[PDB]
Amino acid sequence: INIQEDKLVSAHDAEEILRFFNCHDSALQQEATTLLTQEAHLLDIQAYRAWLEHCVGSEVQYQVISRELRAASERRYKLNEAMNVYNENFQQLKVRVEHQLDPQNWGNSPKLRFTRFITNVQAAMDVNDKELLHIRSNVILHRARRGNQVDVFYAAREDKWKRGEGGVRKLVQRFVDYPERILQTHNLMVFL
Amino acid sequence: INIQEDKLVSAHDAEEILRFFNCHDSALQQEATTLLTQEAHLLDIQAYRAWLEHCVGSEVQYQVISRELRAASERRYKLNEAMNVYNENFQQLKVRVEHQLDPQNWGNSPKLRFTRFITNVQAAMDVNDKELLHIRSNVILHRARRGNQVDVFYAAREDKWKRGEGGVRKLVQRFVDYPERILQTHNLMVFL
Amino acid sequence: INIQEDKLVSAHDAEEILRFFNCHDSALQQEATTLLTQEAHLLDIQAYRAWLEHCVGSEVQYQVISRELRAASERRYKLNEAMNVYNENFQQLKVRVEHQLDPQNWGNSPKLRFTRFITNVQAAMDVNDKELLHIRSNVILHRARRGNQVDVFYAAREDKWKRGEGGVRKLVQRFVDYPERILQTHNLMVFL
Amino acid sequence: MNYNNKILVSESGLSQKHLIHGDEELFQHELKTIFARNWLFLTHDSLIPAPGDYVTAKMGIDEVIVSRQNDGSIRAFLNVCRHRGKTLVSVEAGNAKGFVCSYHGWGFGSNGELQSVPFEKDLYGESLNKKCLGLKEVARVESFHGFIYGCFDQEAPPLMDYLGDAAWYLEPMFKHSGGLELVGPPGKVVIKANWKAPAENFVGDAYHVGWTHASSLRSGESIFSSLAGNAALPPEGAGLQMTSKYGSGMGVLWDGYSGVHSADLVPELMAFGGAKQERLNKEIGDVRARIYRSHLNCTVFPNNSMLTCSGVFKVWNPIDANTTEVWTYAIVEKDMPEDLKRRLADSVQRTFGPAGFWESDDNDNMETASQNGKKYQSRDSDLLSNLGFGEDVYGDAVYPGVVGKSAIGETSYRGFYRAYQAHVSSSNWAEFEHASSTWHTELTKT
Amino acid sequence: MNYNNKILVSESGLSQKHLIHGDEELFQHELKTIFARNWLFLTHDSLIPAPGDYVTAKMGIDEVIVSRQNDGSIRAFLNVCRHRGKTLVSVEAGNAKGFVCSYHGWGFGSNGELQSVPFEKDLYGESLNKKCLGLKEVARVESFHGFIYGCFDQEAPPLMDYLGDAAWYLEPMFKHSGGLELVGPPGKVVIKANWKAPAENFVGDAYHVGWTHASSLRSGESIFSSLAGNAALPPEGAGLQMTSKYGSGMGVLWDGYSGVHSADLVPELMAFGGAKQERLNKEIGDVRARIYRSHLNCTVFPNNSMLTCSGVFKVWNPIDANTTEVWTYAIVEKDMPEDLKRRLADSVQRTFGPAGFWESDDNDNMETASQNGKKYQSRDSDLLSNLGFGEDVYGDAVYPGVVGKSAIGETSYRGFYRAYQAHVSSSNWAEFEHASSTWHTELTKT
Amino acid sequence: MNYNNKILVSESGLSQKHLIHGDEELFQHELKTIFARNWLFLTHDSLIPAPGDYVTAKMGIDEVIVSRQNDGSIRAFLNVCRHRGKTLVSVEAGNAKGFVCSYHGWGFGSNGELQSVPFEKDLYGESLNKKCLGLKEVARVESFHGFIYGCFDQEAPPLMDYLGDAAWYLEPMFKHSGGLELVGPPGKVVIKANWKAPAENFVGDAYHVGWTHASSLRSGESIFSSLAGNAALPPEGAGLQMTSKYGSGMGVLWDGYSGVHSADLVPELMAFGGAKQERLNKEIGDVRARIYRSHLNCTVFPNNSMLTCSGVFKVWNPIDANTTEVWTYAIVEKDMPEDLKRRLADSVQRTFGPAGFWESDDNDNMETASQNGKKYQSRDSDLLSNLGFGEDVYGDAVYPGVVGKSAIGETSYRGFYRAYQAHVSSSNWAEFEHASSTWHTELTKT
Ligand SMILES: c1ccc2c(c1)ccc1ccccc12
Ligand SMILES: c1ccc2c(c1)ccc1ccccc12
Ligand SMILES: c1ccc2c(c1)ccc1ccccc12
Ligand code: FES
Ligand code: FES
Ligand code: FES
Ligand SMILES: [Fe+3]
Ligand SMILES: [Fe+3]
Ligand SMILES: [Fe+3]
C-alpha cells in the first residue's frame, strides 16, 4: 500500500498487511485457526492456569493500548500517544490469573459467563525468524454476570506465536489497539 | 485439566475440552463447518420445515437451560440448579415450527429478519460410538423486527450429530447453557 | 425447498440456497474465505484506494437495500418495495472513497476505528458462467469514534466475484438486504 | 398530577386512562401506594425448606433476602448493608447462617442481626450499637399453603383476608389437593410493558385467547384447541369470572385440567385430576371438587398471576412504566408422580417460559398497549373494560365474590382497577378501607 | 419553566436559548404547542393512489394510519385500538378494507368505524355503542398538489393559508411543472439531534454549505462544487432568502436545477429543467419559470424539509429532545422519463439518504449542537441568528414574504423561531394570531 | 426537594441519606452547587507544556478546552461555538493557534477570541461585534505545583486556600520532592456509580482495603499484603486521617512508599523514596520528610482523587446520578529515572486503570451502593460514617486539620459530607462560608 495515496492508512497497518498478502500457506491458516479456537475455549471455561501452561510463552508480552484522540492533521504535539491497559510479562499474567482464582475474589461469585467469537484468521511465517508465526485475528468477547450485566468487547489482535516446551506453539506477543477510547463495559478485565 | 488446581473450571467443561485436544481431524472440522453453515442458512431464511427435514434427527434432544445464580462456595443447597428454556423432542420442535408457519401468527407480520454468525467450530468423533460426531460451535444470532426492535443472542453449543436417512448427518443433541440469566431480548423464541 | 410448504421462505432465498447445497468444493470455500478476509482487512485499516484497486471490479454493482415493512398476507399493494441505501457503480464508489480521503472531511478527525467479523462463508461457481464465483458471507461491522460512539452493523452479503486484471478475483456484485428497517447507528456510511 | 382527585379509573371500573400504562410519575407513585402497601409474592416453602436456605426476591423495585430461620419461620430483609448501602447478596439462592458484606466485611445473621464487625473492639470499641443496625426487615411475611408473601406495611390485612373471596376458589387446588410445590428456578425475561398489562390479562382476559393465541391453540392441540382463530365460542355455562374487595380476581373454565399442555400430556393429566376430583367430592362437595380440576386464570393483586392446572406461576416485577421483569415458575401437585412433575414443569416453560410459544403471542399486545400510554394523543384516552357490566352479582349462594356467570367478560378487570384506584388515591390502609366500603355495590350497578 | 413568560427566542428572532435543543420539559411542551397544533407531513397521493391503500406515519410522537377512502378522499386515524389500546397496524404500507386488532380481534374499517366485534351478540348483546368507538380521527387532512398533511387541531388555518408567502415559491415546481411524485419507501435513520437542528438547517442555512460539505462538494463535482472549503462565495444576486407568518421559509439559489447531483446527472437535468422553463415563461412569467428551476432549501414548519431540484424530501420525526427519526424520500417531476426518475431517486438517497455522503457531513454539527443544549453552562447561552438583520424587506413587488435579497443569511431562521416562540407561549391558534399580528414588522426592524 | 431545609447529611457528618447516590433532581442541583462552584481538575503542565498545546477536559458535565497561551499562562474555555453551539474541538489533545468550527467555519484563537468569520465583510459588513463573541471563559484557572484546576465561580477562594489543611500534607510530595509530572493519556472507563461513591472511598476509606481488596493484596504481594482478608490490622500509630474546611481530606499510611505496586517495584521504590527522605529531613524536618514517602489516599473536593506513592490520579467525571466517567492518570516524580517512570506508569494502570485488578475489586461495591440509592425502601435510609467520632482533634501541634490519629476511620467522610451539605444548602460562596464558620467544632463534638 502507498500511504501517501491511501491517506487514512498508518505505516504500521500497511506493514502488517504486506505480511499476509505475500506467501499464503493454506495449512498454516488452518493450524492458526485451531490454536486460536483452543485458546478461546480454555479462556471461555475460565481454565486460566491451563491457558498459561498450554498457550502462553515464558517470554510473552501481552499488550492492549488505548490511544489518545488526536487531530488527523496533527504534527506538532509529541507526547505519549497511548497508555497500556495491559502490558504484561508472564509473571504479571500469572498475578492476574491468581487474582481470578482467589476464593476471596468476591466479584467472581456468582461465576461469570464468557463466550468468545474468533474470526478473520490470517497466518504467515516470519521471513527472518523461520520459527516465528505471525497470526492476526479478530475477537468478539461477551461477558455476562449478575443477572443483567452484559459487556461486549470487539478487537483485532496482532500475535506472534512460537514453538516452546514439547514443541507446543505458544503466544509470545499479543498486541491490541483497543478501538473504543472510552470503555462502556465497566472495565477491560477480560483477556482479549 | 486439573479442576482442583484450575479452581473456576467445572467438571463438565473439563471433560468437553478433553474431547477436542486429543485427535484433531482437519477434514472433520471442515465437514462440521459446512454442516453448521448450511443449518444456519436454512434457519436464517426461515426454512423451518427444511431445517427439520435436512438437519434434525428423529431422536433429537434440543435443550437450552438457564442456571440459577448460586455462590461459588455453595455446597449445601441442592435443589434444581436449572430450568429448561427448551428441552424438545422432534415432535415438540415440529409444534414450534408449525407455530412459526401459522398464518395467524400475528407476530410474524411483517416478516422477521434473522442473521446468524457461527464461529469457533470444533469436531471430534465419539470414541465408543464411531458414528457419533461431537461438534462445538458458538453463535451470535441477530433478530430484527418491526422497524426498531433488535435482539442479539450469544451462546456456545454442544452438539452431537449422526448419519440418518440417505446418509445425511443430522442433529441428535444440542445443549446450550444460556450465558445471560435475565434475558434482555423480550423472549428466547429463536433456534440457537 | 418447496416454498408452498415452507411458507415463510421467499423465492429468492430458496434459489440462493439451491446454489450451495449442490456442488461443494472445499478448496473454493477456502479461496473465498481468504478473499473476504483480505478485503475486510483492507477496509478495516481504511485502505479504501487499495480496496478499489485490489478488490473491486470495473463493472461492479454495489447494492444495499432497505425493504418497506408490508403484511405477510399482502397481495394488492404493488409499489416500490425497497429503496437503495447504496446502488453504486465503480465511479460512484470512487466518489465515496475520495470523500473519505478528503482532508476537509471533518467527521474523519479523530480517525475512526473499524473492526469487521466475516463468517458463514459459502462459495459456488456459476453453472452457466464458469468464471463467475458466487460467494455468500455474513458480516458484523463495529465502528467506533469520538470517545463513546459505537455502532454495530449486521448483514448477509450475496456476492459475485470474477477474475480481472492480473487474474485477480474482484467483486462484480454485492447485494445486501439490510435487516433493520430503521437504522440506530446514526447512518449507514460503512462499506458492508 | 393530584392523585387524590384525578379520575384514573372511572366509576365501576368501566374504563381507565391510557396514561396509567405509561406515566413515570404515576409509576413512582405506585411504588408507594401499590407496592409498599400490598402483599407481594416472595417464594415457596419448597424453595427454602431447610434452616439457612434463602432466596432473593423483588418487592416492587426493592430486593429482599428471604430466609428460613432455625425455628422454621421465614423472615425477609432488604438486601442492603446497614453501613454504606452495598447490596449484600449477589446470588439468587443458597444456604447460609449469615451474609457478609464484600465492602467492609460486616456480617449479618440469617435473622437480620448485625453479628460481627471486623476489628470492632479496636475500631469502634463499645460505641457501635449493633442491636440498632440489623437489616431493614419486611414488616409482614405470611403463607398461603406454602406460598410466601411479604408486605412492607404493618397495617395491611392478614394475607388470608386480603385474598378475600378469591381464596375460596384457590383452596381446592392449593389446600385440598394435598398441596402444591413450586418448581424452580424461574425463567427471567424483561419485556417492554407496564406490569399492569400482563396483570390485567391474567386476572380477567379470556376474550383474547382465541385470537391472540390462534397459532398456539392450532399448533399444540391442547384441550382448548377449539377456540383457535375465534372458530368457536365456549358453550354457555363453560365458566365464570370473579373479583374481590382487595383486587384479586380470576376466570374459571370448567373442567380444563390439562390447560395449555399439548396432547402429549392431556390423557395423563385428565386421568390424574379426575381421579382426585372423585376423592374430593366426598370431602369438599361436588362444586368445589370440580373447581379443583378447573382452569383458573388468576391475579393475586397487584402483580402475581397464575394458571392453575396449566401450572403457570408468574411475577410481573416492575422496573419502570414500560419495563417489567417476568419471573416464571411451574406449580405442581405434591402427590403427582415425580416423572409427571418433571414433564409438567418443562411444559409450563415450553408454553409460558422465556421461549414459551404461547407467551410470545402476547408480547406485542402488552408492549404496544403499554407504550401507547406515553403517546400524546392517547394519554387522556379511555381503555374500555365494560364487557358484562350490569350482569355481575354479589353474594351468590354457590360462588362468592363479585361474579359474572359467563366464561368471557371483563368483571375481573373492573374489580382489579377499582382496587387500584382506591389505593392510588389513598395515603394508608384506613383510607383504602373507607374508599372501598361499597366496593361490591359499585361493581354490580347497571 | 413558565412558557407564557420565558424569553426562549429574543425579539426579531435574533437569538435563541441553547436549552431549546436539550430541555425535555420543553420537548413535552412542544408536543402540545407545536406538534398537536400545526400541519405535519403524512404522505403523497403517489404512495396511496387507490382505494384501500394505506401507510403509517408519525405526527409528533403519535402514529397514524393514513387511508385512501372509496370516495377518493384521504382520512387519517390514530394507530391505536379503541378497546385496550394495542397498536392496530404493524406494517408501513399496504392495501386493505379494514384493520383487525391482534389482541381481541376488533375490526375497524378503512374509514375508522368499528365494524365488527368478535361474538358481539353473545358477549355484548345490544349494549356496545360501536358508533362511538371509531378510531380517533385526525381532525384535518389537506393536500398541497398531492402532498398530504394532517393537523390534530380543528382550529388551524387551511393548509394553503398556513404556507403563507412560501406557497408562491413552491408552486412553480409543485403545481406548474405538471406535478411531482414522491418515490418511496423512505430511508429511516435515528440521529441524536433535536428535530429543530435539521429543521433550522434546511430552512435557512446556506452559510454552512461550503465548509460543512467541503468534502462532498469537492468529491461529487455537483453544480455547486465551486463552494468547496469556502473557496468561493456565490456571486451577488445568486439568490435570496424568505420567511412567512406561520414559520415556513426557504432559500432560493438561482438556476441550480441539478442541485447536489453528481456530474453523471448534471447535463440531463440542466437540459430537462431549461426546456420546461422555456415553456413556463409563457404561462407563469419569466421570474416564476426561473424559480421552478432554482434550488429551494425549504422547511414547511415545523418539521418537514426539502431541497427542490435535488429532489430531497425529509421528515424530522421527534422522539425526545436529543433524538430524531429522519425519513428521506425522493421527489420527482411526473413527466420526467421513468429511467431519469429512477436515477434521480437513487441519487437523492446516495447524497442525503441513510448512507448519504452529504447528509453524513451534517451529523456531528446537528448532534453536538443539540446535545450541548443539555450542558449546564450552555443552557442559558444564546444561539445567534442575526446575519442579515436590518436588511430584510416585506411586501416586495416581485418576491413575497419577509425577504433577504442575498443568497446567504439568517432571515429564514428568524422567521422560523419567531413562529416557534409565538406557539410555545400560546394556548391556542387565537393566541398565536394575537402574538403574530405584527410578525413582519418585528422581522424587518433595524 | 427543598435543599435549604432538607437534612441530607446529619450533624457532624455522621450519616447521609442514601438517596444522595441516586436522586437525579439532586444530581442536577449538584451541577449548580457543587460543580459550577468548586475547583475541578483540568490537566498538568506536563501535558500542555508549550505555547499552543491544548487538551479537552470535563468540568462537571461541561467540556472545556484548556490551552497554553503565548505568555505561558493557561486559559480554559467552553468547548462550544458562539454561533449555533456546535462542539468546537473533537480531539483530546493537540497543538494549535486556534480552533475552527466545522459548521460555518468561525475561527477562534487559543485565547478564546473570535478571530475570523468566513466572508465577514460580504455577509456581516461591520455589524458583527467579534469582541463580544469570544468563547465562554472559565473564570478561574490556578496551579498547585503544576496541577491545573478550574472554577466557573469568580467568587471562589484561591485554590491554595481551598485546599486548606490538606495542602500541608500534599506539599512534601507535590513541592519538596522536586515536583511531579502527570503521565498521560489517561485511561477512560464508564462505571454505573454516583461520583460520590469513589470520591468518598478515596478520601477516607482504609477500612475496606483488607476485605474488598483481599484478592489483589494476596495476588500482587505489594507492601500492604499483610492486610489480605482482614488477616491483620495495621499496628497502632500506622497512620492518621484528616479533613478540612472546604471538604478535601486524606488518609496517611506511614512509610508505604511502594504503595500498591507489586514486588517487582518494591525494592527500587523503597530505595528511591528513602534516599530522598534522607535529603528532605534537613530541608523540611523529619515529620514532613516522612509524610513525603507515606501513602496518601486523598480526595481534592469534590471529584479529584489520588494515591500518592502508588501514583494513581483520578477524576470522577459526573454523567448522571448512577453514571460516572473515570479518568486515570499516573503521577511520577520528575527526578526519577525515565525507565522507572515508565514502569511506574504501567503499574498504576495495571492496578487501577481500565483493566486495573485492584480497581475491579471496587466495581460492585460502588455500583450497587449507588444504585440502591434509587430503590424505594432505601432512599430515606441512613448511610453511616460514625467510625472514630468523638476522637478527632483540631489544631494539633504537629498535624493540621481535623485529625483522627488512627489509620482506619471515617474522619474524612465526615469532613467531605459536611462541606457537601453546606454547599447544597447554599446559593453562593458567602452562604457556604456562613454555614461553615464552626466547621471544625461540628466535626470534633463527642
Ligand atoms: C391469560 C393467559 C391464558 C389464559 C387466560 C388468561 C385466560 C383463559 C385461558 C384459557 C385457556 C388457556 C389460557 C387462558
Ligand atoms: C440544507 C442542505 C443543503 C443545502 C442547504 C440547506 C442550503 C443551500 C444549499 C445549496 C446547495 C446545496 C445544498 C444546500
Ligand atoms: C482507596 C483506594 C486505595 C486505598 C485507600 C483508599 C486507602 C488506603 C489504602 C492503603 C493501601 C492501598 C490502597 C489504599
Ligand atoms: S457497605 Fe457493607 S460493610 Fe460497609
Ligand atoms: S386491544 Fe384491540 S381488540 Fe382489544
Ligand atoms: S455553529 Fe460554529 S460556525 Fe456556526
Ligand atoms: Fe395471552
Ligand atoms: Fe448540510
Ligand atoms: Fe478500593
Task: Provide an overview of this structure.
The complex is a heterohexamer, with three copies of chain A (192 residues) and three copies of chain D (446 residues). Chain A has a single domain, classed as Nuclear Transport Factor 2, Chain: A (Roll), CATH 3.10.450. Chain A has a six-stranded mixed beta sheet. Helix content of chain A is 26%, strand content 36%. Chain A is built from four helices and six strands; from the N terminus they run αααββαββββ. With 192 residues, chain A is of the alpha+beta class. The radius of gyration of chain A is 18 Å and the shape is globular. In chain D, 30% of the residues lie in helices and 24% in strands. Chain D is built from 14 helices and 21 strands. Chain D has helices spanning 24-35, 120-123, 159-163, 166-176, 196-204, 209-212, 214-220, 266-284, 286-292, 338-352, 357-372, 411-424, 429-435, 439-444; strands spanning 15-17, 40-44, 53-59, 62-68, 74-78, 93-95, 98-100, 107-109, 114-116, 140-144, 147-151, 180-191, 239-243, 249-253, 295-300, 304-307, 312-320, 323-333, 382-384, 393-394, 402-404. In chain D, a hairpin with a 5-residue loop joins strand 13 and strand 14. In chain D, helix 5 packs across helix 12 (411-424) and helix 8 packs antiparallel against helix 9 (286-292). The longest helix of chain D is centred in the middle third of the chain and has 19 residues, at 266-284. Chains in contact: A-B, A-C, A-D, A-F, B-C, B-D, B-E, C-E, C-F, D-E, D-F, E-F. At the A-F interface, strand 1, strand 2 and helix 4 of A face strand 6, strand 12, helix 7, helix 10 and helix 11 of F. The structure holds phenanthrene (PEY) (3 copies), FE2/S2 (inorganic) cluster (FES) (3 copies) and fe (iii) ion (3 copies). Chains A, B, C: InterPro entries: NTF2-like_dom_sf, Rng_hydr_dOase-bsu. Chains A, B, C: Pathway: Aromatic compound metabolism; naphthalene degradation. Chains A, B, C: Pfam families: Ring_hydroxyl_B. Chains A, B, C: Keywords: Aromatic hydrocarbons catabolism, Dioxygenase, Oxidoreductase, Plasmid.
